[PDB]
Design a protein around this nucleic acid. Structure first.
Lengths: 157, 85, 122, 544, 325
DNA sequence: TGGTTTTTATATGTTTTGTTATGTATTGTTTATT
DNA sequence: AATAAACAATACATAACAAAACATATAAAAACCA
């Protein structure tokens, strides 16, 4: 229960420890220091905000593997639930839903989505647009099916 | 202090109807009679707000004050203790 | 027992809250962090959805059907405009108000299992 | 050019045909049910309007049509040697006692001359109608929307009609199309007139939703129109349970809308729609054969195939190694009738008349069928306890049904029919990156015009100052880009004199700020409180 | 209460505003704007197919949609449907809702003439509007199903269209199968306009279009304090030459001390001051060419007998160095 | 069609009523003494 | 329990104003006879 043991400072050496294990690049690793320095002034509880930001960028920088492997999405949160020694996975998801709207009015994430080209983009411009030709996920998609196919049929023969 | 039929809610309205058209009460802000024709015709087109609040909340005011009731109501009636406060 | 639907039922139960309540007190006592006899006060828009989002069982966000039942309730003459019945849509200065007595509110509170007599405190 | 002038006119498929044979055929079942209730409503008023011979015969007959939609039209009998006319009075035509009389006398009078083959428009015609038109009079009053009218006008109106009761050649009949709440109506009128009303009253109910006699009917006629050629998934039908429960007045027009739009979705994207008639087997292609593979019940049964048959040489051969046996593996399961349709029709007529139960919803009856909760469905009457074994059906996990189904697995008709309106607007203005992809290099380093203040518009107080908001707005704009932008164009001359001014940046901000907050008034986001002062405004739009 | 105010702003004249505004709205985000416009172009066959079902199509979204509707209605749809039924193409009747001068009588007088006058409908013309359209509806229930008209209603929450007797008029039009109703609104409280009665007649469907357009035409009727300090800025440019001087002597000692009441001057000494420079003969000759400053509301008087200018401290020195000098 | 009357939208004025801020007066709180 | 005195905390009377009810006016829409 380290996340609920609040009011402790994560120094410049401390925060880069928290992101080099989750494989963050240098672009965001300075930005986490940059926006903690933004939020070291107006904070309420330092443990909750520092973890809520690191999950959604790893949701957006690893989505070339996350959309291509669904199993690693539990892997990245549980390895922090062991690192932060949390209660369960109930409270950690309550953080990442919270601060996501709290960072939606800022600048850099609107860059970090369109800089990383990561998203998928043409789905959202067809989901929010209300397209009849949008993907209906009663199906498994052809790529993930082929990922399922080549894994199983080579396991078969 | 003693056999008197206390009435309901749904019936006092029928008694309350005659009391306002016996002019013992007035509506709070109701100019009664216009002087001439075209001032009355300007009041006919005007849709009103007091009807848009319901019957039991039209703020009725008083025509005959409480203290004058003691002088007319005889002491033989049982409510004579209620004329004075 | 009134015909209107469930989200419209909670739409009525939030509109009765600003009978004896004023904007000076409501935001303190309903924080996320008696005029039962008296004539009702005057609303504005979005103070409803201020109270409606609070007292509903994050579980709801789409407000298209919530906006549907407002002018449904306007045709029932249970909540009416202060001004004439014409321009009340586009947000100019338009004040709103209920026209239902306390008892029909009290039955419709228990008809959706919601408790109202707690929040009326002289 | 002309857009400131108002209303100027100007005078400038193998798949879809199989929809066309299905759509109208369904709609013949729709409107034929629509005229049934139309004949129902027209019947039950007509017999009840007549044959009511009261003894006092100095009272009008009144009819309260509770639950009615203020649009219920009425026809009348001919009933020769007497004219029978209809007058309608819309609350728009109810300004006073005076014009409620005067328009209504006008409306019957032209109706009187047209059947007859100068006068005054008041009750003078009513007594002389025997002499002015020969035969007698029986008028009827279609009060359309009765609860919007100031009732003291209506109460003073009916006393005026009370004076017409002494001529004996005229008969009066009143139709009160309320929306609801009969108890509200006896509160508003004068009690002396309710006792005038209470002579021969009839509280006929007219509701589109009355014990679901048509709601369960129209969904039933939907099922046979799509019988055996499709399915209806569980997440689809609960949407039809939840959302249709939010509209009390007219379910039946809404169930036509959301079902037919759902059918429009299937024909527009699904390639296997052509195969619902087995004559179209010649249209088979490898592209059709490729897209059949990603069906979830297809691949899951293959996972069921390997574990059941640990010899997989047969299962590998019937995979894409062959193609003739591969489609023959598909058309084995092609003609699946799925008797959940027929089992519904088996049990629907049963409890309708065997146990004779009417308070039931066939859609959740179909939904509880889809999970197996039919046993926990019939419990609410405890009348199928002698019949729960013969009306029993376990829903089988059918195969290949995911190609012939309807479901809101994509959230499409959730979005395009019931849109989260101020949610989707507010999501469009905070993010703006998932809507928009020389001068575009400025766009990669500067937000669009409407959205850039919106992040500070969230971060502002309840009532805000105009200028300090602009002062905060000038913070978000960096200086070097604008002078790079204002000096981008050498061709124009009139802009370039402004471009060389040393105060151009602070002038171009207030120009651009007064194009955005100018454009936040037609959206109603910000209201200008206390006009001709406009130093402070009010923000009503909150995130939720 | 030290508040920064819009009066204390560096203001911008008429030609300076509108030209640099025209520069942004045609060069700010041009490349991604047509990049959006090509993306949504593939939805155009989907709208054509649903519109055969008589569905009242409604477009919401941020930004102006006026350009998008006129491309979608005129060029794309209206000849496409005429070719698919088998000759002049389908008549388009737009309704400019941002134009406040739309009435219910005039547009419906166009409608019955746009629609077929097969009978003497002027006989039923006698408020007969709902009466005349009811006789139109039941006849149209038994006609062959084909669209003959598509109408467009821009800015349906507009200042005249949002009136309630006009709204119900459009409601009865939408139930007819022969006409397709493609409209757009812009308000955030637009679904307050309809109950389940009207939407039953409407059967609306919704689609998002957000191109973040500047609303050029829709900004014209709207006004703010850009559109008095600026009002009397032009009257002084055409007067007598003496009024410039007697306002110059007015503006000096009224700014010798915001421009409020307290900096003002008494009438007697100001008569003597404008007698000192051989300008004012007496009180009447002073006041008569001071009523001209009064008639165009260019100066105020409150009570010494204080006449004071109602413009700000910053404004009067702008009036000093530019127009008086 | 065409004039005439009636209603509505827009615009401003009048009187009552209810809210808030603030400087000054009142009232409570503590401690020593009778 | 009462008195006194210094000090702090709260209430009160009114000033300044806002806003809603109450009221009128006129050009434009809108019915409406004709």
């Amino acid at each position: 229960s380290l996340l609920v043991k609040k009011y402790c400072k994560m120094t410049t050496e401390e925060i880069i420890r928290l992101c080099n294990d989750f494989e963050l690049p240098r672009e965001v690793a300075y930005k986490i220091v940059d926006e903690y320095n933004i939020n070291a002034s107006r904070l309420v509880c330092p443990w909750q905000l520092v973890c809520g930001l690191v999950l959604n960028c790893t949701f957006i920088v690893f989505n070339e593997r996350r959309r291509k492997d669904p199993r690693i999405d539990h892997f990245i949160v549980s390895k922090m639930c062991s690192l932060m020694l949390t209660s369960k996975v109930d409270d950690v998801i309550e953080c990442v839903k919270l601060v996501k709207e709290l960072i939606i009015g800022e600048k850099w994430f609107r860059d970090l989505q369109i800089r990383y080209d990561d998203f998928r983009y043409d789905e959202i411009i067809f989901r929010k647009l209300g397209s009849m030709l949008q993907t209906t996920n009663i199906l498994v998609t052809d790529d993930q099916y082929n990922i399922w196919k080549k894994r199983i049929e080579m396991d078969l023969a | 202090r003693i056999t008197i039929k206390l009435w309901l809610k749904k019936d006092v309205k029928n008694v309350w109807e005659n009391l306002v058209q016996l002019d013992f009460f007035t509506e709070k802000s109701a100019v009664g009679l216009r002087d001439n024709a075209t001032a009355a015709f300007y009041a006919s087109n005007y849709q009103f707000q007091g009807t848009m609040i319901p019957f039991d909340l039209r703020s009725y005011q008083m025509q005959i004050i409480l203290q004058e009731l003691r002088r007319i109501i005889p002491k033989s009636n049982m409510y004579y203790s209620w004329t004075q406060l | 027992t009134y015909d209107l639907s469930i989200i419209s039922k909670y739409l009525l139960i939030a509109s009765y809250i600003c009978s004896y309540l004023e904007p000076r007190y409501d935001a303190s006592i309903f924080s996320r962090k008696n005029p039962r006899y008296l004539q009702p006060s005057l609303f504005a828009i979005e103070r409803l959805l201020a109270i409606f989002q609070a007292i509903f069982p994050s579980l709801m966000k789409a407000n298209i059907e919530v906006f549907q039942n407002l002018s449904e309730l306007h045709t029932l003459k249970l909540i009416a405009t202060t001004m004439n019945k014409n321009i009340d849509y586009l947000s100019p200065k338009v004040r709103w108000k209920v026209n239902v007595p306390w008892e029909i509110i009290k039955e419709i509170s228990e008809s959706v299992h919601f408790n109202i007599s707690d929040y009326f405190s002289d | 050019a002309d857009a400131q002038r108002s209303h100027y006119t100007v005078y400038p498929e193998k798949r879809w045909e199989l929809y066309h044979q299905l759509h109208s055929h369904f709609h013949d079942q729709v409107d034929h049910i629509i005229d049934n209730i139309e004949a129902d409503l027209k019947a039950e008023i007509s017999d009840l309007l007549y044959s009511e011979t009261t003894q006092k015969r100095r009272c009008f007959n009144t009819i309260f049509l509770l639950g009615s939609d203020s649009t219920t039209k009425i026809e009348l009998k001919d009933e020769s040697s007497r004219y029978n006319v209809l007058i309608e009075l819309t609350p728009k035509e109810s300004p006073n006692v005076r014009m409620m009389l005067r328009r209504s006398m006008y409306k019957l009078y032209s109706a009187a001359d047209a059947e007859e083959h100068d006068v005054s428009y008041d009750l003078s015609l009513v007594e002389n109608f025997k002499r002015l038109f020969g035969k007698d009079l029986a008028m009827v009053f279609n009060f359309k929307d009765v609860d919007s009218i100031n009732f003291n006008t209506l109460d003073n109106f009916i006393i005026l009609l009370k004076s017409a009761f002494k001529y004996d050649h005229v008969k009066i009949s009143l139709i009160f199309n309320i929306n609801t709440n009969l108890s509200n109506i006896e509160k508003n009128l004068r009690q002396s007139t309710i006792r005038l009303l209470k002579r021969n009253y009839h509280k006929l109910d007219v509701s589109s939703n009355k014990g679901f006699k048509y709601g369960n009917q129209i969904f039933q006629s939907f099922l046979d129109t799509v019988d055996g050629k499709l399915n209806l998934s569980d997440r689809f039908v609960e949407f039809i349970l939840s959302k249709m429960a939010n509209n009390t007045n007219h379910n039946l027009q809404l169930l036509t809308k959301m079902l037919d739009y759902s059918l429009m979705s299937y024909f527009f994207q699904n390639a296997f729609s052509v195969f619902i008639d087995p004559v179209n087997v010649d249209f088979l292609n490898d592209d059709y054969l490729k897209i059949l593979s990603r069906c979830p019940t297809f691949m899951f049964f293959v996972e069921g195939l390997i574990k059941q048959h640990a010899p997989a040489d047969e299962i590998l051969s019937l995979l894409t190694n062959k193609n003739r046996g591969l489609e023959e593996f598909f058309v084995e399961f092609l003609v699946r009738e799925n008797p959940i349709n027929g089992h519904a029709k088996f049990v629907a007529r049963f409890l309708e008349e065997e146990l004779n139960i009417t308070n039931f919803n066939l859609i959740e009856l179909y939904h509880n069928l889809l999970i197996g909760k039919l046993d926990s469905y019939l419990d609410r009457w405890s009348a199928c306890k002698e019949y729960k074994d013969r009306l029993h059906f376990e829903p089988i996990d059918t195969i290949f049904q995911e190609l012939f189904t309807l479901d809101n697995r994509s959230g499409l008709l959730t979005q395009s029919i019931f849109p989260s309106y101020k949610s989707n607007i507010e999501d469009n203005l905070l993010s703006w990156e998932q809507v928009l992809p020389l001068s575009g290099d400025l766009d990669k380093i500067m937000a669009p015009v409407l959205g850039q203040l919106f992040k500070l518009y969230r971060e502002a107080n309840m009532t805000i100052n105009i200028y300090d908001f602009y002062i905060a707005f000038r913070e978000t704009l960096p200086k070097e880009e604008i002078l790079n932008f204002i000096r981008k164009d050498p061709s124009n001359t009139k802009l370039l004199e402004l471009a060389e001014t040393p105060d151009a940046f602070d002038k171009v901000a207030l120009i651009l700020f007064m194009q955005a907050i100018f454009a936040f008034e037609n959206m109603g986001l910000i209201k200008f409180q206390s006009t001709k002062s406009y130093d402070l405004v009010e923000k009503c739009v909150w995130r939720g | 209460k030290s508040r920064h105010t819009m009066s204390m702003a560096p203001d911008v004249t008429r030609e300076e505003f509108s030209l640099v505004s025209n520069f942004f709205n045609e060069n700010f985000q041009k490349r991604p704007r047509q990049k959006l416009f090509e993306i949504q172009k593939k939805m155009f066959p989907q709208y054509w197919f649903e519109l055969t079902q008589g569905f009242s199509l409604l477009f919401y979204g941020v930004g102006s949609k006026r350009n998008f509707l006129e491309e979608f209605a005129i060029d794309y749809l209206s000849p496409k449907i005429a070719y698919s039924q088998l000759v002049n193409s389908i008549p388009c009747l737009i309704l400019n809702g941002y134009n406040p001068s739309c009435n219910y009588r005039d547009v419906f007088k166009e409608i019955t003439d746009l629609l077929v006058p097969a009978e003497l409908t002027r006989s039923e013309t006698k408020n007969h509007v709902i009466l005349q359209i009811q006789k139109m509806i039941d006849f149209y229930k038994n006609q062959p199903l084909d669209i003959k008209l598509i109408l467009v209603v821009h800015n349906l929450d507009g200042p005249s269209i949002r009136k309630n007797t006009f709204q119900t008029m459009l409601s009865f039009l939408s139930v007819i199968r022969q006409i397709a109703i493609v409209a757009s609104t812009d308000h955030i409280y637009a679904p307050l306009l309809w109950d389940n009665m009207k939407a039953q007649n409407y059967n609306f469907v919704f689609h998002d279009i957000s191109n973040f357009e500047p609303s050029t035409v829709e900004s014209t009727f709207q006004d703010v304090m850009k559109m008095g300090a600026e009002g009397a800025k032009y009257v002084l440019q055409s007067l007598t030459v003496n009024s410039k001087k007697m306002y110059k002597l007015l503006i000096e000692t009224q700014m010798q001390n915001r421009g409020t009441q307290r900096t003002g001057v008494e009438l007697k000494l100001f008569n003597h001051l404008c007698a000192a420079d051989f300008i004012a003969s007496n009180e009447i000759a002073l006041r008569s060419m001071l009523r001209e400053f009064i008639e165009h509301k260019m100066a105020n008087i409150t009570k010494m007998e204080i006449i004071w200018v109602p413009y700000t401290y910053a404004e009067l020195e702008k009036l000093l160095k530019t127009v008086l000098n």
